[PDB]
Amino acid sequence: TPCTVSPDFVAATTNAGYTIELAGGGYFSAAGMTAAIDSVVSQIEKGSTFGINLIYVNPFMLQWGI
Amino acid sequence: GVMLWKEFDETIFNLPKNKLVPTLEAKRDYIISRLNADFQKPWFATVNGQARDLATMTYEEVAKRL
Amino acid sequence: NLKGRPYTGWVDSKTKEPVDDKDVKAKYETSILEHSGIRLIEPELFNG
Amino acid sequence: GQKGGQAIVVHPDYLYGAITEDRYNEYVAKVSAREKSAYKFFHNGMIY
Amino acid sequence: QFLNAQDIDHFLSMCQNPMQKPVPFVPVLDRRFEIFFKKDSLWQSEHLEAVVDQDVQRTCILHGP
C-alpha cells in the first residue's frame, strides 16, 4: 500500500528488470489511479509492463478498479 | 505509536458498546497525554502543550492549531 | 442528517426544514410580536 | 395592605474604589475566566 | 471567546467529510474514537515532514518479523 503506490518506484523496479504490482490501496478514484499509471508509463522503457494490486475486501476499490 | 495502538486494542476497543464511553471518560486525561506524547494523530485541543477540549479553546487558538 | 445531507443549524420546529439566522426575522418576527407581550388572553394557556 | 418598599442600587464601579489594585486585577482575571465558562455552558444548554 | 456550541458541532461535521483527506488529529473522545484513532494510518512513514516532531516513533511502519 504505502511502498509500491509511488509510480517512481514501480518505474525504477520495472526499469531494473523485475516485476512489480502498482498498489490500488493508495488510490480512491479511477481518475487518481489513471494519473499514476500514466506517470509509470512515461518513466518506463518501450515494451516494459507492470501489474496492479486491488484488495477484494474494499468493494469500493473494485467497482472503480476493475 | 504502535505500542499505544496495541494497549488500546487490549484496554478500550475490545470493550462492548455500552461500556466504551464510561471507560473513555474515566481515562480521558491519560488517553489525551498518550496521543500527544506518542501518536501520529495528536489530541487536537492542546494549546502550548496544555490539554483542553474544543469547547474550552478560542476561535484564534483553533485556527492557529489547524 | 437532513434528507441525506449532513446539517448543523436551526430548523423550523414543525416542518424540520433548515432555517438560517439571517432568515429568522423574515420567517418569524411577525409571529413572535403577535404572540408576545400584552395581548388578548389566549385560552390554550389558561386551561381554556 | 399598606406595603411600601424602596431600594437604591449603586453602580458597581463604586465598589472597586474600596479595594487595592492587586485585589482588583486578581478579581478581573477570575471573572473574565468565569464569563467564558458560563458562555460555553449557556450555548451548550440552549441547543441541547 | 471559547467556541460556540454550534461551531464545535460544525467542526466535528467537517472532520467526518469523506471528500477530504482524513484529518491529522483526534478532535473528540466519543463512540467514534476507534475510527478517528485508526483511519488513514499508513501514509505518515512516507512523509515525516508533516508529522508532529518529524518523529518516526509516532508512526505505523508495516514490516515482517
- What is the DSSP annotation of E27-42? ---STTHHHHHHSS-S
* A66 Cβ contact list (under 8 Å, min separation 6): A54
Q: Are B19 and B27 in contact (CB under 8 A)?
A: no
How many Cβ atoms from other residues are within 10 Å of residue B1's Cβ?
Answer: 22
Q: Is A35 left (phi over 0), alpha (psi -120 to 50) or beta?
A: alpha
CB contact under 8 A, E6 and C9: yes
Pairing between β-strand A51-53 and β-strand C10-11 as defined by DSSP bridges: unpaired
* φ/ψ (deg, to 5) at E26: -105, 110
> In terms of C-beta distances under 8 Å and separation of at least 24 residues, what long-range contacts does E29-36 make, across chains too?
E29/B24, E29/B25, E29/B28, E29/B31, E29/B32, E30/B21, E30/B24, E31/B17, E31/B20, E31/B21, E33/B12, E33/B20, E33/B24, E34/B12, E34/B13, E36/B41
**Angstrom distance (rounded) from CA A18 to CA A48:** 10
Nearest residue of E to residue D43, measured between CA atoms: E5
Contact residues on chain E for D46, CB-CB shorter than 8 A: 5
Look at residue C5 and give its three-state secondary structure: strand
Kindly state whether D20 is in contact with chain B, defined as any CB-CB distance less than 8 angstroms: no
Proportion of chain D in helix, strand, coil states, percent, rounded to 5: 70, 0, 30
CB contact under 8 A, D44 and E6: no
Length of chain B: 66
Shortest alpha-carbon distance between residue A47 and chain E (Å)? 30
- Residue A52: strand pairing partners: A22
**Angstrom distance (rounded) from CA A66 to CA D7:** 83
Quickly tell me which residue has 467564558 as its cell: D36
**Which residue, among E1, E3, E4, would best test binding to D if mutated, counting the most D CBs under 10 Å from its CB?**
E4
**Angstrom distance (rounded) from CA D44 to CA E9:** 10
HSE-CB of E24 using CA atoms within 13 angstroms = 14
Cell of C44: 390554550
Quickly tell me which residue has 502543550 as its cell: B49
* CA distances, A63 to each of A24, A28, A30, A31 (Å): 12, 11, 10, 13
Look at residue D48 and give its three-state secondary structure: coil
Q: Are A1 and A23 in contact (CB under 8 A)?
A: yes
* CA distances, A28 to each of A33, A54, E41 (Å): 8, 11, 15
Contact residues on chain D for B55, CB-CB shorter than 8 A: 40, 44
**Angstrom distance (rounded) from CA A4 to CA A21:** 7
Shortest alpha-carbon distance between residue E11 and chain D (Å)? 15
* CA distances, D14 to each of A6, D9, D22 (Å): 72, 11, 17
Nearest residue of E to residue B61, measured between CA atoms: E2
Cell of B56: 474550552
Picking from D40, D47, D48, the nearest residue to E2 by CB comes out as D40
